[PDB]
Design a protein around this ligand. Sequence first.
Ligand SMILES: *C\C=C(C)/C=C/C=C(C)/C=C/C1=C(C)CCCC1(C)C
Ligand SMILES: [Cl-]
Length: 218
Amino acid sequence: VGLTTLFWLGAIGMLVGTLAFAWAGRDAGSGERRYYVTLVGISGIAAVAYVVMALGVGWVPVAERTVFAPRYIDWILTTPLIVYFLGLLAGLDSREFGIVITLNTVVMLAGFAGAMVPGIERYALFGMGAVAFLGLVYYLVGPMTESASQRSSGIKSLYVRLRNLTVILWAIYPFIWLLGPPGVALLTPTVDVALIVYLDLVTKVGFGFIALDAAATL
Ligand SMILES: *C\C=C(C)/C=C/C=C(C)/C=C/C1=C(C)CCCC1(C)C
Ligand SMILES: [Cl-]
């Protein structure tokens, strides 16, 4: 198994998700459509990013390592969509959406910049993102959860189900970044990539399938 192969698997998984979310969003009421559209964009962007990486593009040499730029472009665009999805589910008002979306962006921009910096100062960027991520988790389990408590029993359950999925799995990315090439480079690129592809598919497509499951029921 090689990087190219892992990237293709990522692209295929994202493509299957995209097609299923677009298809499932065939009917979609005049207000429940925004959810499906977010799911299609999320997995859609990731698919492209992966095909691009698969086609060997965006492999940027930094110091003595490689940085998959497409991966970060993907995250910078898709993570805010996920937050937006949870915000819609939790029923947030513009103000709260703003705070969570900016914290998210700080996390992603910081991780991207840190990866691109060859020197040791890069850990200072990683720290920024990590700190911003804590604030994000705070809003997900506190203020956003409280807000979701105002929605019906089932919507509240879906929100909690997706919230846990997101919080637990997102908390793992930083550890892989730190042990992978960007950090101490303990884990090899292939191992780093294999792990991240699994994580990307679950936090994106699995996340979408759990949502579809809930929708069907209700
Ligand atoms: C494609 C889907 C997802 C959910 C991608 C998520 C990426 C992260 C949660 C990345 C997080 C980072 C953190 C929390 C700390 C600083 C360094 C990272 C950018 C790797
Ligand atoms: Cl990388």
